[PDB]
Amino acid sequence: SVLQVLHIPDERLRKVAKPVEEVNAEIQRIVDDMFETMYAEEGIGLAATQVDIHQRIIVIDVSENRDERLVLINPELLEKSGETGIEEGCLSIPEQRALVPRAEKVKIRALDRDGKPFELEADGLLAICIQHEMDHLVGKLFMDYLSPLKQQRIRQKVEKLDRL
Ligand SMILES: CCCCC[C@H](CC(=O)NO)C(=O)N[C@H](C(=O)N1CCC[C@H]1CO)C(C)C
Ligand code: NI
C-alpha cells in the first residue's frame, strides 16, 4: 500500500520514535509499504515518523536505477567524521530544498528487513541521506538548521502548494 506522507506544519512530525521491539510480519509490511511510498513519491529515503508510524524504521534507495533497497531498523550511530552539505529536499516539505550541515562519513549499526544486525560505513549521498532519515526519527527536519526567515519562506510555500 502507498501511505500518505505528513507535511509541515503537522506536529506529528516532531514525535520521537520508539525502537522496533521485534522485526516481524507487521514490521515487514510497514517496511514494504514505506518503500512503495518512497518510490511513488520519488524519494531516496523515508522514515516511519513521516507516515505517522512512530517507530525507528527507515527505508532508503540511493541507486541510479532505483533497485537497491536498504532497510535501517533501530539504527545507531557508532562513529562519524568530517563535514559536508548539499541542497536537501524532504517529502514532508514538498518542493523546497536547502543546504544543511552534515557529517561527511558515518558508521552505523542497524537491523535489516529480516531482523539481522549489520554494520554499515557510508559516505557521499548515502551518508547524507542516513543522517536526514535519522533526524526524522528524533523529530528533526532539515529546515530546523536554517534562519527564521528561511523557515518562514519554506512554510509559506508548502502551505500554498498544499492549498492548491
Ligand atoms: C539528501 C538527503 C535525503 C533526502 C530524503 C528526501 C526524502 C525524505 O523526505 N526523507 O525523509 C529525498 O528523497 N529528497 C530528494 C533530495 O533531496 N535529493 C534527491 C537527489 C539528491 C537530493 C537533492 O540534492 C528530493 C526528492 C527532494
Ligand atoms: Ni525528509
Q: Is the CB of 139 under 6 A from ligand 1?
A: no
**Does residue 129 have a known ligand-binding role?**
no
Mutate to test the pocket of ligand 1, among 8, 90, 145 (most ligand atoms within 8 A of CB): 90
Q: What are phi and psi of 88, to 5 degrees?
A: -90, 145
Torsion (CA) 71, 30, 52, 134 in degrees, nearest 10: -10
Ligand 1 center to residue 121 CA distance, Å? 20
Residue 144, Cα to own-chain centre: how many angstroms? 14
51, exposed or middle or buried, with CB in 10 Å at 0-12, 13-18, 19+? Answer: buried
Resolution (A): 1.8
Q: C-alpha distances in angstroms, 5 versus 10, 47, 52, 63, 86?
A: 11, 10, 8, 22, 23
Domains and CATH numbers, the chain: 1-164 (3.90.45.10)
Which residue owns the Cα nearest ligand 1 atom 19? Answer: 44
Question: Hey, what amino acid is at 119?
Answer: E
Write out the catalytic residue numbers. Answer: 133
Ligand 1 center to residue 164 CA distance, Å? 23
SS3 106: strand
Which residue owns the Cα nearest ligand 1 atom 9? Answer: 90
- Cell representation of residue 30: 510497514
Nearest partner of 122 among 113, 110, 114, judged by Cα: 110
How many Å apart are CA 2 and CA 29, to the nearest integer?
11
**Does residue 136 have a known ligand-binding role?**
yes
Q: Is the CB of 50 under 6 A from ligand 1?
A: yes
**Does residue 90 have a known ligand-binding role?**
yes
Experimental method: X-ray
Ligand 2 center to residue 118 CA distance, Å? 23
Largest CA distance in the chain: 44
How many Å apart are CA 100 and CA 19, to the nearest integer?
26
**CB neighbour list of residue 38: distance below 8 Å, 6 or more residues apart:** 44, 45, 46, 59, 61, 91
